[PDB]
Write an enzyme that holds these catalytic residues in place. Structure first.
Site, mmCIF file in Angstrom:
data_model
loop_
_atom_site.group_PDB
_atom_site.id
_atom_site.type_symbol
_atom_site.label_atom_id
_atom_site.label_comp_id
_atom_site.label_asym_id
_atom_site.label_seq_id
_atom_site.Cartn_x
_atom_site.Cartn_y
_atom_site.Cartn_z
ATOM 1 N NE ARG A 224 70.632 77.275 -19.612
ATOM 2 C CZ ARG A 224 70.349 77.272 -18.372
ATOM 3 N NH1 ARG A 224 69.093 77.501 -17.707
ATOM 4 N NH2 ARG A 224 71.252 77.224 -17.574
ATOM 5 C CG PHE B 264 62.318 76.137 -24.813
ATOM 6 C CD1 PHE B 264 63.251 75.704 -24.059
ATOM 7 C CD2 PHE B 264 60.916 76.496 -24.267
ATOM 8 C CE1 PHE B 264 62.831 75.314 -22.614
ATOM 9 C CE2 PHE B 264 60.744 75.855 -22.874
ATOM 10 C CZ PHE B 264 61.693 75.174 -22.261
ATOM 11 C CD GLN C 264 67.130 80.245 -17.593
ATOM 12 O OE1 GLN C 264 66.847 79.463 -18.187
ATOM 13 N NE2 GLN C 264 67.435 80.176 -16.204
ATOM 14 C CG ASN D 202 61.644 77.013 -10.331
ATOM 15 O OD1 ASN D 202 61.975 76.204 -10.195
ATOM 16 N ND2 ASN D 202 60.504 77.542 -10.476
ATOM 17 C CG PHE E 9 61.586 81.414 -18.638
ATOM 18 C CD1 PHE E 9 61.595 80.958 -17.453
ATOM 19 C CD2 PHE E 9 60.727 80.704 -19.632
ATOM 20 C CE1 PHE E 9 60.436 79.975 -17.018
ATOM 21 C CE2 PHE E 9 59.686 79.924 -19.051
ATOM 22 C CZ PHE E 9 59.475 79.714 -17.730
ATOM 23 C CG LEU F 196 57.870 75.383 -18.981
ATOM 24 C CD1 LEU F 196 58.428 76.309 -19.484
ATOM 25 C CD2 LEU F 196 59.142 74.487 -18.144
ATOM 26 C CG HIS G 153 58.988 77.556 -14.388
ATOM 27 N ND1 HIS G 153 60.279 77.599 -14.083
ATOM 28 C CD2 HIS G 153 58.988 76.002 -14.848
ATOM 29 C CE1 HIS G 153 60.754 76.675 -13.939
ATOM 30 N NE2 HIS G 153 60.392 75.668 -14.998
HETATM 31 C C1 LIG Z 1 63.619 67.434 -29.111
HETATM 32 C C2 LIG Z 1 63.881 68.745 -28.211
HETATM 33 C C3 LIG Z 1 62.823 68.884 -27.287
HETATM 34 C C4 LIG Z 1 63.246 70.317 -26.530
HETATM 35 C C5 LIG Z 1 63.347 71.599 -27.673
HETATM 36 C C6 LIG Z 1 64.001 72.882 -26.563
HETATM 37 C C7 LIG Z 1 62.027 71.991 -27.641
HETATM 38 N N1 LIG Z 1 61.239 70.686 -28.302
HETATM 39 C C8 LIG Z 1 61.475 69.442 -28.002
HETATM 40 O O1 LIG Z 1 60.728 68.554 -28.486
HETATM 41 O O2 LIG Z 1 61.176 72.445 -26.545
HETATM 42 C C9 LIG Z 1 59.946 72.684 -26.595
HETATM 43 C C10 LIG Z 1 59.368 72.839 -25.217
HETATM 44 C C11 LIG Z 1 59.183 71.811 -24.277
HETATM 45 O O3 LIG Z 1 57.909 70.989 -24.423
HETATM 46 C C12 LIG Z 1 59.640 72.137 -22.755
HETATM 47 C C13 LIG Z 1 58.158 72.952 -22.566
HETATM 48 C C14 LIG Z 1 59.385 70.918 -21.866
HETATM 49 C C15 LIG Z 1 60.686 70.084 -21.995
HETATM 50 C C16 LIG Z 1 61.921 71.040 -21.321
HETATM 51 C C17 LIG Z 1 63.080 71.340 -21.838
HETATM 52 C C18 LIG Z 1 63.830 72.215 -21.156
HETATM 53 C C19 LIG Z 1 65.142 72.539 -21.674
HETATM 54 C C20 LIG Z 1 65.612 72.038 -23.204
HETATM 55 C C21 LIG Z 1 66.125 73.355 -20.937
HETATM 56 C C22 LIG Z 1 67.218 72.445 -20.477
HETATM 57 C C23 LIG Z 1 68.182 73.173 -19.657
HETATM 58 C C24 LIG Z 1 68.939 72.602 -18.369
HETATM 59 C C25 LIG Z 1 69.700 73.296 -17.709
HETATM 60 C C26 LIG Z 1 70.346 72.858 -16.540
HETATM 61 C C27 LIG Z 1 71.200 73.729 -15.757
HETATM 62 O O4 LIG Z 1 72.326 72.925 -15.699
HETATM 63 C C28 LIG Z 1 70.776 73.730 -14.145
HETATM 64 C C29 LIG Z 1 68.997 74.091 -14.228
HETATM 65 C C30 LIG Z 1 71.652 74.838 -13.402
HETATM 66 O O5 LIG Z 1 71.678 75.966 -14.215
HETATM 67 C C31 LIG Z 1 71.181 74.791 -11.957
HETATM 68 C C32 LIG Z 1 72.178 75.338 -11.105
HETATM 69 C C33 LIG Z 1 72.074 75.622 -9.610
HETATM 70 C C34 LIG Z 1 73.216 76.404 -8.944
HETATM 71 C C35 LIG Z 1 72.740 77.372 -7.841
HETATM 72 O O6 LIG Z 1 74.263 76.358 -9.185
HETATM 73 C C36 LIG Z 1 69.694 75.752 -11.715
HETATM 74 O O7 LIG Z 1 68.881 75.169 -11.026
HETATM 75 N N2 LIG Z 1 69.507 76.839 -12.225
HETATM 76 C C37 LIG Z 1 68.357 77.559 -12.203
HETATM 77 C C38 LIG Z 1 68.722 78.985 -11.967
HETATM 78 C C39 LIG Z 1 67.470 80.080 -11.864
HETATM 79 C C40 LIG Z 1 69.338 78.940 -10.672
HETATM 80 C C41 LIG Z 1 67.769 77.330 -13.767
HETATM 81 O O8 LIG Z 1 68.293 77.664 -14.877
HETATM 82 N N3 LIG Z 1 66.678 76.703 -13.539
HETATM 83 C C42 LIG Z 1 66.108 76.064 -14.792
HETATM 84 C C43 LIG Z 1 65.521 74.552 -14.143
HETATM 85 C C44 LIG Z 1 64.693 73.991 -15.109
HETATM 86 C C45 LIG Z 1 65.112 73.121 -16.236
HETATM 87 C C46 LIG Z 1 64.563 72.488 -17.285
HETATM 88 C C47 LIG Z 1 63.056 72.399 -17.233
HETATM 89 C C48 LIG Z 1 62.620 73.370 -15.973
HETATM 90 O O9 LIG Z 1 61.117 73.347 -15.912
HETATM 91 C C49 LIG Z 1 63.383 73.970 -15.136
HETATM 92 C C50 LIG Z 1 64.927 77.036 -15.227
HETATM 93 O O10 LIG Z 1 64.022 77.406 -14.361
HETATM 94 N N4 LIG Z 1 64.756 77.123 -16.499
HETATM 95 C C51 LIG Z 1 63.476 78.016 -17.002
HETATM 96 C C52 LIG Z 1 62.939 77.092 -18.042
HETATM 97 C C53 LIG Z 1 63.550 76.411 -19.159
HETATM 98 C C54 LIG Z 1 64.870 75.820 -18.345
HETATM 99 N N5 LIG Z 1 65.593 76.708 -17.487
HETATM 100 C C55 LIG Z 1 65.826 75.181 -19.552
HETATM 101 O O11 LIG Z 1 66.614 76.027 -19.843
HETATM 102 O O12 LIG Z 1 65.412 73.965 -19.826
HETATM 103 C C56 LIG Z 1 59.694 73.821 -27.593
HETATM 104 C C57 LIG Z 1 58.029 74.268 -27.622
HETATM 105 C C58 LIG Z 1 60.132 73.368 -29.005
HETATM 106 O O13 LIG Z 1 59.289 72.194 -29.666
HETATM 107 C C59 LIG Z 1 61.799 73.025 -28.722
HETATM 108 C C60 LIG Z 1 62.359 72.632 -30.275
#
Ligand SMILES: CC[C@H]1C[C@H](C)[C@@]2(NC1=O)O[C@@H](C[C@H](O)[C@@H](C)CC/C=C/C=C(\C)[C@@H]1C/C=C/C=C/[C@H](O)[C@H](C)[C@@H](O)[C@@H](CCC(C)=O)C(=O)N[C@@H](C(C)C)C(=O)N[C@@H](Cc3cccc(O)c3)C(=O)N3CCC[C@H](N3)C(=O)O1)[C@H](C)[C@H](O)[C@@H]2C
Length: 164
Positions: free
Chosen positions: A54, A59, A62, A101, A112, A121, A125
């Site tokens: 990913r 951003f 991962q 996580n 990541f 975050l 994290h």
């Molecule tokens: C308008 C767009 C918006 C978003 C964009 C991307 C942007 N700005 C923006 O304004 O983001 C900002 C930053 C934002 O402000 C951030 C800091 C806050 C908002 C968060 C956005 C997060 C995301 C876009 C993505 C969304 C992805 C979701 C994925 C979902 C999966 O389906 C699910 C997590 C799944 O894989 C399950 C499966 C469980 C199983 C056993 O089957 C799971 O739990 N997976 C875990 C594995 C480690 C096992 C996993 O991948 N966990 C994620 C959970 C997560 C999801 C969202 C936020 C989190 O804090 C945490 C995880 O730990 N990460 C690491 C951190 C990022 C996250 N993935 C992610 O990809 O996060 C940056 C600076 C920049 O301006 C860009 C343009």
């Protein structure tokens, strides 16, 4: 001294370059040790050959799922999961290395690398290292990502280990 580990990144089998990390063993020793050991492969399993599943430009990148290779797997050197060590360090900018996580106390092997400051975050994290050299390689990896995070090419860790 804080250990240094490296990843040699490949794109569709072609060498892209090397990224090095300083691991903050002085502040998060348990978390740093997990990443170090998985990088050397000394426990019999680890990051070598795994991919970045990913990548969201602007951003983070991962990776770390070496068991299921579909984004849901991975495991730690302590067992399936381990606790959140502490939240002393923050996601202050590009180059920060932090643990992915699935909720509190579910750290495994997924991590990541941030390419921007990501305040939301903090406290969710565990930050445990930072890019030392090769930030330009991380920036190049971003070119293969997308909104949803799906990559256009296969980005793998062709080799990895400990330098210092
Ligand atoms: C308008 C767009 C918006 C978003 C964009 C991307 C942007 N700005 C923006 O304004 O983001 C900002 C930053 C934002 O402000 C951030 C800091 C806050 C908002 C968060 C956005 C997060 C995301 C876009 C993505 C969304 C992805 C979701 C994925 C979902 C999966 O389906 C699910 C997590 C799944 O894989 C399950 C499966 C469980 C199983 C056993 O089957 C799971 O739990 N997976 C875990 C594995 C480690 C096992 C996993 O991948 N966990 C994620 C959970 C997560 C999801 C969202 C936020 C989190 O804090 C945490 C995880 O730990 N990460 C690491 C951190 C990022 C996250 N993935 C992610 O990809 O996060 C940056 C600076 C920049 O301006 C860009 C343009």
């Amino acid at each position: 001294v804080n250990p240094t580990v490296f990843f040699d990144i490949a794109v569709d089998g072609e060498p892209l370059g090397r990224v090095s990390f300083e691991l903050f063993a002085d502040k998060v020793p348990k978390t740093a040790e997990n990443f170090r050991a998985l990088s050397t492969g000394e426990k019999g399993f680890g990051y070598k050959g795994s991919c970045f599943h990913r990548i969201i430009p602007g951003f983070m990148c991962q990776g770390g799922d070496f068991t299921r290779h579909n984004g849901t797997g991975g495991k730690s050197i302590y067992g399936e999961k381990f606790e959140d060590e502490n939240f002393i360090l923050k996601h202050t900018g590009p180059g920060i290395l932090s643990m992915a996580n699935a909720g509190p106390n579910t750290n495994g092997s997924q991590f990541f690398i941030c390419t921007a400051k990501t305040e939301w975050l903090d406290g969710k994290h565990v930050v445990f290292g930072k890019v030392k050299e090769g930030m330009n390689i991380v920036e190049a990896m971003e070119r293969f990502g997308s909104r949803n995070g799906k990559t256009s090419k296969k980005i793998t860790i062709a080799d990895c280990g400990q330098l210092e």
